[PDB]
Amino acid sequence: VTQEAQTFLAEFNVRAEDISYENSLASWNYNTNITEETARKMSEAGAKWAAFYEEASRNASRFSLANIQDAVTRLQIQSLQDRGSSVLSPEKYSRLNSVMNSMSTIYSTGVVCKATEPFDCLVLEPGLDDIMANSIDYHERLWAWEGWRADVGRMMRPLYEEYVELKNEAARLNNYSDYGDYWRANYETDYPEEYKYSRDQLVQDVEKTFEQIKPLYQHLHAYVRHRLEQVYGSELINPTGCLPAHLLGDMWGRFWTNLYNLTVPYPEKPNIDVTSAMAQKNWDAMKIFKTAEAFFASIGLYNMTEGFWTNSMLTEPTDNRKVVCHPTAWDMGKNDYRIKMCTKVTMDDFLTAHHEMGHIEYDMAYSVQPFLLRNGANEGFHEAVGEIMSLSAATPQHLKSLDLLEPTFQEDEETEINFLLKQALTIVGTMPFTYMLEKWRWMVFNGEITKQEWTKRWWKMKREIVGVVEPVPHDETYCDPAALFHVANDYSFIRYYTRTIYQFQFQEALCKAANHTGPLHKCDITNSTAAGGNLRQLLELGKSKPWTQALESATGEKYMNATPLLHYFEPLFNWLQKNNSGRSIGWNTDWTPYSD
Amino acid sequence: VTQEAQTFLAEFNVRAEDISYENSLASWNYNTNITEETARKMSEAGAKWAAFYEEASRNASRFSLANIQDAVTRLQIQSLQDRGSSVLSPEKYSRLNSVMNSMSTIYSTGVVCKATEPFDCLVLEPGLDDIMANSIDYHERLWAWEGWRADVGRMMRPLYEEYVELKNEAARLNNYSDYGDYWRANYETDYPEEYKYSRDQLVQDVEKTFEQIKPLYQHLHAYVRHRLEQVYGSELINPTGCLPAHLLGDMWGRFWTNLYNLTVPYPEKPNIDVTSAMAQKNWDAMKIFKTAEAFFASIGLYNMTEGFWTNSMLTEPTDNRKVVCHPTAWDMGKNDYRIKMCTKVTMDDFLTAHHEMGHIEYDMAYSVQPFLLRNGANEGFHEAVGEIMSLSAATPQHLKSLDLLEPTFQEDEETEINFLLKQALTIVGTMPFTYMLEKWRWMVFNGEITKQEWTKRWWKMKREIVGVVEPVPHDETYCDPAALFHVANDYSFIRYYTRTIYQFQFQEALCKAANHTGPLHKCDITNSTAAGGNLRQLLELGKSKPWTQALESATGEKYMNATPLLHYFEPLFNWLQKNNSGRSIGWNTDWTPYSD
Amino acid sequence: DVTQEAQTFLAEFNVRAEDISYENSLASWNYNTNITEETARKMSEAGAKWAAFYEEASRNASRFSLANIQDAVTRLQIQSLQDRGSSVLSPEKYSRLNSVMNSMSTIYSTGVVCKATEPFDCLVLEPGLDDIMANSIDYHERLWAWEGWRADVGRMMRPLYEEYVELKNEAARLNNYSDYGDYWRANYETDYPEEYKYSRDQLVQDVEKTFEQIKPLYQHLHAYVRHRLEQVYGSELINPTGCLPAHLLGDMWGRFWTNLYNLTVPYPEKPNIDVTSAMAQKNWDAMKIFKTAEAFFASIGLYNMTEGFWTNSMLTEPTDNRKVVCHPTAWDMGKNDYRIKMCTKVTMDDFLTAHHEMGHIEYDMAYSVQPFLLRNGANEGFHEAVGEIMSLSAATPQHLKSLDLLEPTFQEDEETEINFLLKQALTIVGTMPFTYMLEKWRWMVFNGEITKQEWTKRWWKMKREIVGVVEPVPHDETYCDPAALFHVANDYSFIRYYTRTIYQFQFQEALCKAANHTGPLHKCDITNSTAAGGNLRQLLELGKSKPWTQALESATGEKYMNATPLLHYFEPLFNWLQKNNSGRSIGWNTDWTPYS
Numbered sequence A, B: 001v002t003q004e005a006q007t008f009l010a011e012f013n014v015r016a017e018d019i020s021y022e023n024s025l026a027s028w029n030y031n032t033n034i035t036e037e038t039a040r041k042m043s044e045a046g047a048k049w050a051a052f053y054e055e056a057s058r059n060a061s062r063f064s065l066a067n068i069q070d071a072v073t074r075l076q077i078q079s080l081q082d083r084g085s086s087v088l089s090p091e092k093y094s095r096l097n098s099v100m101n102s103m104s105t106i107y108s109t110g111v112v113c114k115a116t117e118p119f120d121c122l123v124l125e126p127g128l129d130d131i132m133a134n135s136i137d138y139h140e141r142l143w144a145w146e147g148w149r150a151d152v153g154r155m156m157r158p159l160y161e162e163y164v165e166l167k168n169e170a171a172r173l174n175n176y177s178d179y180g181d182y183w184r185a186n187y188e189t190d191y192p193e194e195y196k197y198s199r200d201q202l203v204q205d206v207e208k209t210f211e212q213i214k215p216l217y218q219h220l221h222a223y224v225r226h227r228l229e230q231v232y233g234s235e236l237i238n239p240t241g242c243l244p245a246h247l248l249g250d251m252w253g254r255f256w257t258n259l260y261n262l263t264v265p266y267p268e269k270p271n272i273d274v275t276s277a278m279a280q281k282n283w284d285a286m287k288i289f290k291t292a293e294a295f296f297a298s299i300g301l302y303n304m305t306e307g308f309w310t311n312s313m314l315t316e317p318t319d320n321r322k323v324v325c326h327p328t329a330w331d332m333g334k335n336d337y338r339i340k341m342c343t344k345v346t347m348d349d350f351l352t353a354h355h356e357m358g359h360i361e362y363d364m365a366y367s368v369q370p371f372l373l374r375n376g377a378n379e380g381f382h383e384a385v386g387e388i389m390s391l392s393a394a395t396p397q398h399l400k401s402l403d404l405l406e407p408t409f410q411e412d413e414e415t416e417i418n419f420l421l422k423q424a425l426t427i428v429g430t431m432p433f434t435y436m437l438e439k440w441r442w443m444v445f446n447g448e449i450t451k452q453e454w455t456k457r458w459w460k461m462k463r464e465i466v467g468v469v470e471p472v473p474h475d476e477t478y479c480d481p482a483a484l485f486h487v488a489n490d491y492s493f494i495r496y497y498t499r500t501i502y503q504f505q506f507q508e509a510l511c512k513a514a515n516h517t518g519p520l521h522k523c524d525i526t527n528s529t530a531a532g533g534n535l536r537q538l539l540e541l542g543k544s545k546p547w548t549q550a551l552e553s554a555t556g557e558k559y560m561n562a563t564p565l566l567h568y569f570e571p572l573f574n575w576l577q578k579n580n581s582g583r584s585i586g587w588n589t590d591w592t593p594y595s596d
Numbered sequence C: 001d002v003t004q005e006a007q008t009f010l011a012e013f014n015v016r017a018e019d020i021s022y023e024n025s026l027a028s029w030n031y032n033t034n035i036t037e038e039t040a041r042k043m044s045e046a047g048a049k050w051a052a053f054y055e056e057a058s059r060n061a062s063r064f065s066l067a068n069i070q071d072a073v074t075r076l077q078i079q080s081l082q083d084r085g086s087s088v089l090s091p092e093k094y095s096r097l098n099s100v101m102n103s104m105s106t107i108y109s110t111g112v113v114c115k116a117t118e119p120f121d122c123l124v125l126e127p128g129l130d131d132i133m134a135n136s137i138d139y140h141e142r143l144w145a146w147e148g149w150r151a152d153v154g155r156m157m158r159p160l161y162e163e164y165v166e167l168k169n170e171a172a173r174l175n176n177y178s179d180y181g182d183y184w185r186a187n188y189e190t191d192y193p194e195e196y197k198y199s200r201d202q203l204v205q206d207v208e209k210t211f212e213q214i215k216p217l218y219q220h221l222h223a224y225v226r227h228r229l230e231q232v233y234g235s236e237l238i239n240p241t242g243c244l245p246a247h248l249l250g251d252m253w254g255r256f257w258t259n260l261y262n263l264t265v266p267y268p269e270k271p272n273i274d275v276t277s278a279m280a281q282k283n284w285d286a287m288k289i290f291k292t293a294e295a296f297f298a299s300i301g302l303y304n305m306t307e308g309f310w311t312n313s314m315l316t317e318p319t320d321n322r323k324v325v326c327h328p329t330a331w332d333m334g335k336n337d338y339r340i341k342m343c344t345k346v347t348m349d350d351f352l353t354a355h356h357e358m359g360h361i362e363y364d365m366a367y368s369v370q371p372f373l374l375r376n377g378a379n380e381g382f383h384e385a386v387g388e389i390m391s392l393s394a395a396t397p398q399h400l401k402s403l404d405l406l407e408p409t410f411q412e413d414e415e416t417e418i419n420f421l422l423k424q425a426l427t428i429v430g431t432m433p434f435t436y437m438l439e440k441w442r443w444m445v446f447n448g449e450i451t452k453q454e455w456t457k458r459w460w461k462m463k464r465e466i467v468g469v470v471e472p473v474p475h476d477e478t479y480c481d482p483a484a485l486f487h488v489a490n491d492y493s494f495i496r497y498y499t500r501t502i503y504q505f506q507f508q509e510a511l512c513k514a515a516n517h518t519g520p521l522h523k524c525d526i527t528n529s530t531a532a533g534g535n536l537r538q539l540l541e542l543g544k545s546k547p548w549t550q551a552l553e554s555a556t557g558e559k560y561m562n563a564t565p566l567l568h569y570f571e572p573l574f575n576w577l578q579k580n581n582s583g584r585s586i587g588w589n590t591d592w593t594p595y596s
């Protein structure tokens, strides 16, 4: 029984590595060389992965987990046993395909058109993304926002209602309750009793730690809301009500980082922008990577494979070749670590480079585990591992190490509150947003939000949870969640929440390992070797052991804990309490622009 | 002004000699003992030398060559009027030192790391090298080649471009069109008449002698090509196209010597194994350096000094201290001649013991000349002098005479063809590699090759002139010339080309003077006093007379002639004309390992 | 809310103002095509009617809170209109300034310097001193014209110039500007779209930031001319290591070095590219010039010329018909009236001028569709910049050969290319230090950084500092040498030429992108590129609706002035200038003057 399980697994893994290697290959050649053959050869290789993974999961299903003896085979044979969406019929399964594919190309090809002159039609990326990052014209930020919602979003709704049907349907067939139970199962460490964690206890710990985080945000919300008035006027911001989504710093208010210029604490102070110094010194892309390399190399982490320095696209491919420049790390496989990035000589990219080289390390580290176990402990682990590198690299003492800053930079509590704010805008402001978004999706798969309360219970949950109100009413011809890439591309979103909490559990366990004396935000893990130890011990695990066990072994705690996050931000917490003395620290759920 | 210039050289020759002797001291001390205190003192010495020669150079600039009658004092106040890198502003001097100082420490610290498992990083000092000399794995030789280029070659690229800009500015401040023009100032014997050689003439005559060698290079090329199809196989070697740069037997394809084992014409015959003959003759490093001086005194010349015996490092001083084991012959100045060498009992180091002592004798003959003229008649001479030596030493006449070859050793063609072949790998394989490397710098300093087409035009010349294609496509992010030490450490290269022609013009000259009749390759100048008389007259010259006069007085011809070489390699060619009847001398300059 | 009241006020202002300024352009067209006294009367009457309408309407608009206007467009108009300009000042101080301004302008036009020998005949600028300054090589004749233009006319300005700056500066402050230099620097201030802002300080920084980008280039062009001008004037009058004397630079100021080409021709035995002869043979009039220019615009996609253009425009000096302003200008008369004023000849310079002055007409006819108060180039330089990219493509020997102006057998070797590139530099690179330093000395005089007692004292310290030009005769505070320029006596800004010359190359590179032409930028013509011309249409159709920073982005990709495409253009000359500037210097001693 166990003999055949290891036999079958020994067969699969061989043809599997070889066939998804063809799929990393075909995908690379698409993203770096965007044409139509590459379009074909990518779906031609994806299809081969789908049907080999389909059949092999049916084969795998034959094996009863009760009659397996290895903790390691059970876990392999378990995960391969998830037919996921092949459980449904070929007609229904391809109706889910076309519906999912149409949602996708609707998103990709969207456009909202101006109202005068040539009726110029503008695309999300980057036209609309550019207006939502940099514009302060209330009515032009609205223009883009309600057009993206009433013209693409409208084109989403019927599709999404089928998607939800067919996804829920398939899900149930797999002994899950809704397609949100399917996704929660990523957090399920059932198997060791000391480390048992259910799908339920994910929903609970999510909300629980949000609540631990809610206060900080409400001072960030009350802060931003106030210097949002200075720019748009008292007519347009209710001092004490929810904030309009079009005014949040990108298309959805996913992040608030573009509202920095409007909400910088101490404006008369400089910044930590090294792009200046970086470049003064003829600096190039490699130097960014090769310094990222010596960071990890300093921690006793893995240098970069030769395949890495050849087969990566680290810079934009000069001319005549189109590229999905979004930074990405590919565990291509068969020992093929590559990074995709149209790198520039900027501080953002410098930290982005650290972040992406982190994902590789993780991929190299757990290269040792068998093919089916070579992924992060759970979904939000990869991301946390990545970002903690940016946490250390961005510090001023590390930037004084690399000569990218003169010993003149004063740690003025001003630039400390400047730095911490830009961080929270990004890192805090997304945690209600990401929680509410994936909640709604859970509650729709739940059926708690019936199909006739979608646009009602969405914008209600926006107002009550996130502090964010619609500037124009929406009926049920809109599908505001499918306004966002991940909702319409069949991607989970809770991970970005669980990234955030985990990365500060990590950063604190790591900055304890190196005698760190004081403010978390001034921690750099470099030259630790000791921290890197704990860091290597987790990363080489992939999914070999429950996410609970590796969180405890590296940090000391078996469970998601938002307290370390709250440490990383205490100075700013204290600051928002003291600035927002005369404001209420909360929001109304009855004021809307329309009601004003 | 003759009188004063003379009085000024009077002051300089004494001050100078004394200071660069302290340098020779410091630098030697670094190479016989590699610790911190030695490198520092070495650098402090290089300072005082560098400063002293600037002021000196500046004072000689005051003078006026055409108001100096004595060609001798003309000559001396000339070479003293050249600075370079010093003419540059006090701020740009540092920018050039750092640029090179990081280039050079980039090449020394260079590693490349695998992915197979414990990611193991390998330097090029004792490793990546071994992989290129001893390997048959296309993929691993690609692993090191491509990786050496995409870690280091790239890591040089923004540093070569600065060096090139700042160095051309110095050459031009020194009234030379560019840094190529600067470098070809060596060959300028434009002062004495009838012997004027202009710098651009070197360019033409290097090319004009190159063409004479194309027919021998191309057959040698087209033979190994076939020897490589039988190792790596027809879908890795194009039988009518270039040869992939990584299969060539060192890191750069510079010398094809380690390819003998693949390419040897008669692998069933025997090689010259005086090694084990030296082994059972209880030989030691001393006995080698003693049979070498005993050579140098049968050419009627001088034995070694007492300083050579006690100051030289001839046997590796164990590992109790660390040493630069590259074999160098040091003319330390103030009458002090040393050789640094990690001599073992290898037929090869027995040859390099003759070759390096050759340098010393040349050093000693011209010791009678004034300090600023105590150097070889041009760069090419000195590295040739020592070669005409090892040419004689290893010819089985000379070996039998040392009782190191059987009293009845037979010289059938099979052994004389295996011998000549192996040599031609060493000596003919690198004539194209060398003409084409130095061309490409020349056309970069000149401006003919622009930064947008630096590596496009690099690899295009590697194909046309050299018959050698890249295994991986390289873009403008690499700087493949600086993957090689000489390029990254600011060293002129054509000297290895001029050398290889000279050594054979010299050696026919001396085989004539020795009434040697027959194959040039079987010539020995031992117990030849007519030979040595000729060679001493040339050797005392130093740079006192035009290198043309020098080359004329000893060999008759006063310019480079590729035809003594075509004479030494004549049996080989006739063999490569018949052996390649079925092959196609030539190479397509289009096919690549990556075009299907 | 005020937007609506302001749109009513506009529409009532635009009708009547289009109506009056048309009369104003008419009156003054009638003046510059027919210079009687009745035409002076009517030109003044018309100017004063306008002046009244503008005092009268900028008052009516002063009471309009710009922040209370919703349209960027309808705000930008009301903003412009809100500048009283010089109308702010008293009735007494406005007439003062105007009369101070006229007597400056008339001194300039009527100024003479006389000879000193026989009937003491006196010379004028247009058909007099200019020729001496543009043909002569007799040092002491050039000194006569340059030095008599500054002690007759120049000194007739000084008191008027001091008065004018004090008056023009009150106006400034009363209009909320810190000096008059600020008022001027306004043109580049764009700050309505918050992604696309610019401040009057940023101009100063960026003019200085780009000028440094160009200094190395202008230095080698300076250092080449100086060696040439020694060759003529000898060693005692032109210091090899020092500033050129000021009366030896091509015209009365050295605004352009163009007329030194005869003296600094790189390869003077090649066939010249003056097409003046070929047109002479082919029997061209100006109508052929203007029709080939038209067709050029036609060829790119831009419009042909209106009837009103051909029948109204004076393109030829009136034969037997009164006096005329010859200087090429291009009149956007109003009411869809486009014309050109010019005294064209059959000479290439006018041929190019016909492309660059039909370019303002193309710009005009394009933004015609804009509102009246928005019918201008997005800043000073844009307008001149459009024309100068028309002359670029017109001036290439390739575009010249196509018109049969060059022989079909015109060897376009790199010697005529470097010959052609040098003449471009002599007009273009020569003038940028000229303009910057001058504007820099104007701005600082208005600042107060340059007090009255140091006007001339500072002026020549800046000539010696920024432009490498020294005065052959000492001057003092009874001079006002800067007011010997037309634009200084006639209150015209100047930084435009510096900004124009920077824009034209961001333009040319962006349009040669669209034109599918690769290679040296000097060889790009854009004729028959409907594509190139369409991009140029969507720029040109804007006028001033959107900010310039944003115009530059939508046309070149970039938002800020960039010296780089101008560096690419001249890059070949710049490498050639380095080689042919070897035993020379790259700079100037500020201390040496031809009298000290």
Ligand SMILES: *[C@@H]1O[C@H](CO[C@@H]2O[C@@H](C)[C@@H](O)[C@@H](O)[C@@H]2O)[C@@H](O[C@@H]2O[C@H](CO)[C@@H](O)[C@H](O)[C@H]2NC(C)=O)[C@H](O)[C@H]1NC(C)=O
Pocket: A290, A293, A294, A297, A300, A301, A302, A303, B109, B110, B111, B113, B119, B120, B121, B122, B123
């Ligand atoms: C990681 O690699 C380093 C060497 O690579 C670096 O590359 C550059 C980006 C620059 O940072 C250089 O300083 C580095 O050299 C390894 O350190 C070297 O290892 C070799 C062989 O083990 C040794 O001979 C050298 O002396 C070392 N260099 C120094 C400066 O000490 C390091 O061991 C590698 N670590 C891992 C985990 O792969």
Ligand SMILES: *[C@@H]1O[C@H](CO[C@@H]2O[C@@H](C)[C@@H](O)[C@@H](O)[C@@H]2O)[C@@H](O[C@@H]2O[C@H](CO)[C@@H](O)[C@H](O)[C@H]2NC(C)=O)[C@H](O)[C@H]1NC(C)=O
Pocket: B290, B294, B297, B300, B301, B302, B303
């Ligand atoms: C070079 O030295 C020899 C003697 O030293 C040699 O040392 C050893 C290498 C050994 O193998 C032999 O070659 C010699 O022992 C000089 O020759 C001797 O000179 C003396 C005095 O002039 C004479 O009486 C001896 O007969 C010579 N010995 C031989 C073997 O000929 C020789 O002069 C030296 N050469 C020069 C250029 O100084």
Ligand SMILES: *[C@@H]1O[C@H](CO[C@@H]2O[C@@H](C)[C@@H](O)[C@@H](O)[C@@H]2O)[C@@H](O[C@@H]2O[C@H](CO)[C@@H](O)[C@H](O)[C@H]2NC(C)=O)[C@H](O)[C@H]1NC(C)=O
Pocket: C291, C294, C295, C298, C301, C302, C303, C304
């Ligand atoms: C601009 O005018 C041309 C016609 O120009 C005439 O002929 C050319 C050879 C040139 O020499 C001009 O200076 C002449 O005045 C227009 O081309 C004509 O377009 C119409 C309609 O598009 C077509 O029927 C004719 O065949 C064209 N004439 C030729 C000779 O091909 C051109 O469209 C005008 N461009 C504009 C308005 O932008």
Ligand SMILES: *[C@@H]1O[C@H](CO)[C@@H](O[C@@H]2O[C@H](CO)[C@@H](O)[C@H](O)[C@H]2NC(C)=O)[C@H](O)[C@H]1NC(C)=O
Pocket: B033, B034, B035, B036, B037, B038, B321
């Ligand atoms: C190699 O160099 C080191 C350092 O230059 C020598 O060590 C020094 O020896 C002297 C006298 O013996 C001491 O006073 C110094 O303090 C030593 N310095 C250091 C850094 O140890 C060493 O002697 C040299 N080795 C040989 C074999 O000569």
Ligand SMILES: *[C@@H]1O[C@H](CO)[C@@H](O[C@@H]2O[C@H](CO)[C@@H](O)[C@H](O)[C@H]2NC(C)=O)[C@H](O)[C@H]1NC(C)=O
Pocket: B008, B011, B055, B056, B059
């Ligand atoms: C170059 O020439 C100058 C002038 O003759 C020498 O300058 C003097 O050098 C002495 C000794 O080095 C100093 O004591 C004086 O102070 C110097 N005087 C001046 C005016 O420079 C200089 O030494 C010469 N340099 C060389 C290397 O020969």
Ligand SMILES: *[C@@H]1O[C@H](CO)[C@@H](O[C@@H]2O[C@H](CO)[C@@H](O)[C@H](O)[C@H]2NC(C)=O)[C@H](O)[C@H]1NC(C)=O
Pocket: B133, B134, B135, B258, B259, B261
């Ligand atoms: C070519 O082949 C010979 C024998 O196959 C190799 O010779 C060995 O070389 C090493 C180092 O040079 C010596 O220490 C050994 O003693 C040699 N072996 C024998 C049997 O003599 C040689 O290494 C090969 N060359 C290459 C480039 O692989």
Ligand SMILES: *[C@@H]1O[C@H](CO)[C@@H](O)[C@H](O)[C@H]1NC(C)=O
Pocket: A033, A035, A036, A037, A038
């Ligand atoms: C990109 O793809 C096209 C067509 O698929 C192909 O012709 C081209 O050579 C490719 N370029 C690459 C892979 O660099």
Ligand SMILES: *[C@@H]1O[C@H](CO)[C@@H](O)[C@H](O)[C@H]1NC(C)=O
Pocket: C034, C035, C036, C037, C038, C039, C321, C322
């Ligand atoms: C020029 O002006 C005078 C007086 O204003 C007038 O009489 C004459 O006709 C005018 N000529 C032209 C061509 O306008």
Ligand SMILES: *[C@@H]1O[C@H](CO)[C@@H](O)[C@H](O)[C@H]1NC(C)=O
Pocket: C012, C013, C053, C056, C057, C060
């Ligand atoms: C300014 O206001 C006066 C007063 O009503 C009006 O008569 C005049 O037309 C206005 N001038 C303009 C709008 O130029």
Ligand SMILES: *[C@@H]1O[C@H](CO)[C@@H](O)[C@H](O)[C@H]1NC(C)=O
Pocket: B175, C581, C582, C583, C584
């Ligand atoms: C540079 O040196 C050569 C050699 O004499 C000379 O002919 C040339 O004129 C020198 N150039 C300068 C600018 O001094």
